[PDB]
């Protein structure tokens, strides 16, 4: 939180820590949000209902991405996805002046 996150990689004093935690210090999945940045979440460009609220309109969920690992992996490898939440089903009432 409140870190860009160009600081995070070694700002935790990663030298004297465990490699397991350092796995979450860097990676291909680094997403910038107004609530800081998110490590370990894939940013999808489509919207769902809010499952886990991160903040500033960004929510996170655990979804069957059905990506290349999805096609390859039998389990259809499920990851954590970060998305912009959708307010609700979109509708338009057929308004007329004599209907």
């Amino acid at each position: 939180q409140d870190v860009n996150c160009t600081e995070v990689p070694v700002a935790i004093h990663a030298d004297q820590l465990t490699p397991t935690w350092r796995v979450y210090s860097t990676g291909s999945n680094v997403f910038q949000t107004r609530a800081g940045c998110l490590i370990g979440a894939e940013h999808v460009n489509n919207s769902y209902e809010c499952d886990i609220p991160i903040g500033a309109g960004i929510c996170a969920s655990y979804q069957t991405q059905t990506n290349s690992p999805g096609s390859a992996s039998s389990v259809a490898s499920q990851s954590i996805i970060a998305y912009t939440m959708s307010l609700g089903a979109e509708n338009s009432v057929a308004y007329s002046n004599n209907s």
Binding site: R34, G57, G88, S99
Partner: protein, 249 residues
């Protein structure tokens, strides 16, 4: 007796705060800074810091709950029809404005420009306090001491979209919107329904439709005039912001 022979349709404004600023405090960093001796000493007082963090987190989550309860009452997002012919009732004064990037109605624009937020709506600090984007003296001085402002879950754009949905539902469907399926109804007949609701016959509207529309439009315009002119109109929201800022200071 005394029976009125005419009417005025009046638009009045009511302002209600819905949420505070989501604030969190690192108890250990406030009390002890970076000293390890003070932290070890503070470990001897028990779970006071955990209690304080729990209470502040409860408040923070409650703020999002408040906003959701107020604004997320609508099941579905509605659009007003492209052709905006509502029998003389204008509404191009409270509906979203496509030209502006924010997609806010003009009244919403005036309202957002009258509450300064006390510069308390900033979270990140690096890059030299975001290159002065976040007010240095207040925000950075506060949060160097473990005092952070968390961002709300719903953005301003999302709250504006919820409001637009509510207006679209009201204009295109009436109250059927909120009791089940949305049922379209021409707006003059909606106003006639509502006239029946207050004890006035339908014909009083259909035989005065132009006058009623003109009065409604003029009142809506006067609302912006008053908000733009009248000082301290949004006093309550500013009071909330000022109280939070003063407590943190």
């Amino acid at each position: 007796i005394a029976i009125p022979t005419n009417f005025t349709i009046s638009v009045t404004t009511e302002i209600l705060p819905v949420s505070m600023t989501k604030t969190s405090v690192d108890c250990t960093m406030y009390i002890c800074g970076d000293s390890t001796e003070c932290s070890n000493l503070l470990l001897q007082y028990g779970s006071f810091c955990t209690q304080l963090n729990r209470a502040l987190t409860g408040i923070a989550v409650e703020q999002d709950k408040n906003t959701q309860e107020v604004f997320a009452q609508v099941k579905q997002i509605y659009k007003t029809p492209p052709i905006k012919d509502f029998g003389g009732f204008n509404f191009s004064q409270i509906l979203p404005d496509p030209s502006k990037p924010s997609k806010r109605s003009p009244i919403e624009d005036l309202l957002f420009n009258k509450v300064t937020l006390a510069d308390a709506g900033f979270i990140k600090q690096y890059g030299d306090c975001l290159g002065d984007i976040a007010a240095r003296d207040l925000i950075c001085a506060q949060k160097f001491n473990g005092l952070t402002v968390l961002p709300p879950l719903l953005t301003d754009e999302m709250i504006a979209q919820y409001t637009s949905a509510l207006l679209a539902g009201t204009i295109t469907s009436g109250w059927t919107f909120g009791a089940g399926p949305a049922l379209q109804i021409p707006f003059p007949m909606q106003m006639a329904y509502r006239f029946n609701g207050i004890g006035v016959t339908q014909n009083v509207l259909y035989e005065n439709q132009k006058l009623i529309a003109n009065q409604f439009n003029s009142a809506i315009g006067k609302i912006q005039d008053s908000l733009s002119s009248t000082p301290s109109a949004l006093g309550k929201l500013q009071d909330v912001v000022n109280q939070n800022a003063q407590a943190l200071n």
